[PDB]
Amino acid sequence: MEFAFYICGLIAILATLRVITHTNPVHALLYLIISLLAISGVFFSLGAYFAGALEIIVYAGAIMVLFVFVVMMLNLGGSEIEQERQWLKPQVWIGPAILSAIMLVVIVYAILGVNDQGIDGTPISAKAVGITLFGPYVLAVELASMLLLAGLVVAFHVGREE
């Protein structure tokens, strides 16, 4: 259980690091899908079975499909992206990487000073999640429907062709 957690976390970290430094958009999206599968494995190792199932079903099965679809529609041949490699220049990324490293050290220092009895990994099913969802979290469900409706209306208004 822990062994799967560490391997899946390492795979997610390495795949995301491959994502943010890659030039090909389809390869970057493939590495992102791999990282999402690894994060789903992390979810399954922690007992969040519904979260891992939705991580593959929706995040790696709908949202990344939309990203891949849009990349095909653009026909991205790396025009002025691969031919420049501006993010690979050390003078470009040395600043933001140092900033992200400083923020990571601050967050990790805050994390390490918290009480931790360990995660038991007892499986929390989708039945309990649905009980909470339509019990104490009813208005979250209905206003999330309104949020998805707003996203639908906005994306239809903007993404037409005429």
Place this chain on the structure above:
Amino acid sequence: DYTLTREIVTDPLNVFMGKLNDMVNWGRKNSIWPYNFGLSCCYVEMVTSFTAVHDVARFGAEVLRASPRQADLMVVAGTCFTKMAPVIQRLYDQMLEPKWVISMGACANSGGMYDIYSVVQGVDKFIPVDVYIPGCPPRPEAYMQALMLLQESIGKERRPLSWVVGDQGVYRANMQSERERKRGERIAVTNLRTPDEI
């Protein structure tokens, strides 16, 4: 007696290598996927052979790919018009090894009755042919007979099993001609049915 391509040579055929070659030839001759290519009326007779009354599927030769990459057999079933000849050559070049060619009908054999300004006189002017079918059109069972002739020719050819080990030359069997094979039983014919009946 064999013909080499990389020369009139002899049989190169360990006993396990011969068995592997026989297994590969059996699998290749029993799974022949033709390319769906329509040139003229001979194609109508070919797809007639594909239908229920003849059922060329019984020989495992019905899959009829629309892509040259997935096809193992090219049937030139029709006239090789001069505007269609580069198309035929390009589709043949897009095919992958091993590939075989059947000329179907007098047009594909030699130009047929169309010794005319706009017709290439036979497809073997520019692409190599394995089996020729005379006829205008050959009937569907003539196409099936040519398919069996191609199966016999495939069943004792020699090709490399792998591209990393061994001889990479292709050895094709120098068959006895069907004319000389059938001459004994054809000349002995004396009487035929009179053409006034059904």
Place this chain on the structure above:
Amino acid sequence: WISPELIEILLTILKAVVILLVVVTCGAFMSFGERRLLGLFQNRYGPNRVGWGGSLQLVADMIKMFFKEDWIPKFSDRVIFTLAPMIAFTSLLLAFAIVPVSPGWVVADLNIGILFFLMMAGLAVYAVLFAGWSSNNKYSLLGAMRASAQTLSYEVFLGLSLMGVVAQAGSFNMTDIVNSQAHVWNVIPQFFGFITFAIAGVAVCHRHPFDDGYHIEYSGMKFGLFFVGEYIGIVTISALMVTLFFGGWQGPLLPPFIWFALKTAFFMMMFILIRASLPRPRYDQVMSFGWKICLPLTLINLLVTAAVILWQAQ
């Protein structure tokens, strides 16, 4: 090394391996059986010469596709081009990995179940997308976008068609789903769920009549991987339909695996008959049917199923 725990572990692993091998063999023999059954439906014989009754034909195409020259397009993305048939095979194979073929004969008794099936189908759309993109052919790319838009239009209600059966069982587990069918099979209460699941399962498997092509560049063994994965998906969809709507392995007299195999073979034959019988609708008609008819039908079926369940819980 003699211990009952290790013996049970090895027995369960051996049962899973047997299930995997039988499913892959049944997919290849399903390609051969599609040729034979199309012959039966069309007043002919099909392949009946290579071996006894044509039974050795599949070995002949396997040998032919193995010893065909392996070819990749020159300006193609090699990794993605190789990766598409991997997905097309493995996705619905791993979807089969939850199917209970008999009491005590299952690979994984997961608590997610048909959620794992939905995971596998949502991953399986990438095979079509990757085959279209990586081939470096604009006809193949356009065909892949059309096919993937169709599969999204039917994947949008595949799970909602299963949700009536899930609601009746009260669980995502497949053993609980087939145990809730101990008295009446789910095809009777979830009939509209059954037909919507049938339409969605045929559409996401790229079967007739939902079949400028994204496979024209593939050849040799990758094309065979595409075909064998398609037939494995046919077997997986048929087995899932049997387990979710026709009691799984439950039956009066025959052994449970005999009942499961008979029902799966019947739905396999119905796949073949659907290909032989129906004409192909237009693309816009197919997608309008997916969005306007089937998805509201699944939603209304779920609502009525919940109303019946809560009314019957006194």
Place this chain on the structure above:
Amino acid sequence: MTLKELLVGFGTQVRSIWMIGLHAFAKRETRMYPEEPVYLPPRYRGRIVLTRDPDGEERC
């Protein structure tokens, strides 16, 4: 589309499936070349020969 159109179309699809299944229950129309020899009518235009007169000399 109309509900009646959908129902009529569904019944039409069921009818097509039923007729193809009954076609499966029918007699095969295949002539099994080459095991079954092809019947040819006596004036069929196939291979050309040269014949002999009844005295045995060639007619040409």
Place this chain on the structure above:
Amino acid sequence: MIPLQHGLILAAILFVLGLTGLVIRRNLLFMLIGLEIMINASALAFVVAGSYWGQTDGQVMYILAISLAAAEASIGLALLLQLHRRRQNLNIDSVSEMRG
């Protein structure tokens, strides 16, 4: 027997990686990709926190997070397609006409 700090550290690492990808990339598509990495890392942090406390609240917050991620991906890709239609490039530095 997995520490809560280890899961939070993994989520923080993924979050800062996504933010770095959002900053260093001139392409709008890679910016949207980094945004998706960031929101998925935050949702993973919520899942880790919910699994430590043995509550469904982490998975419920995950559900809300991915609903937001889906709708934001939809809107962002619509705006990216509009940008590609009206400018034929995805350079985000060129979209800078309002300043001062």
Place this chain on the structure above:
Amino acid sequence: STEVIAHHWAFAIFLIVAIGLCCLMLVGGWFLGGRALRLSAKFYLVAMFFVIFDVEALYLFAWSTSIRESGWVGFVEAAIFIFVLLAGLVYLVRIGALDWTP
């Protein structure tokens, strides 16, 4: 329990042998045998509709497995959710968003 760890081992072997079988099939196919347009926005719109309705589908997935525990109150809430879903679908169909042909 021995049964669950046996099933975990069997599932792991299933995934490993399936992936390895497909990999070995590709390797054998490579080793054997000798050698020798602008996409419309409707594609994006359809994929976007799939994403949005798939998220609403996940909400209904969570509801469906716990229908008896939620009671009639959960039925009323899910009926409101499904009515909002269907109103959005009716709106999409009526404005020509879901019409492939113009």
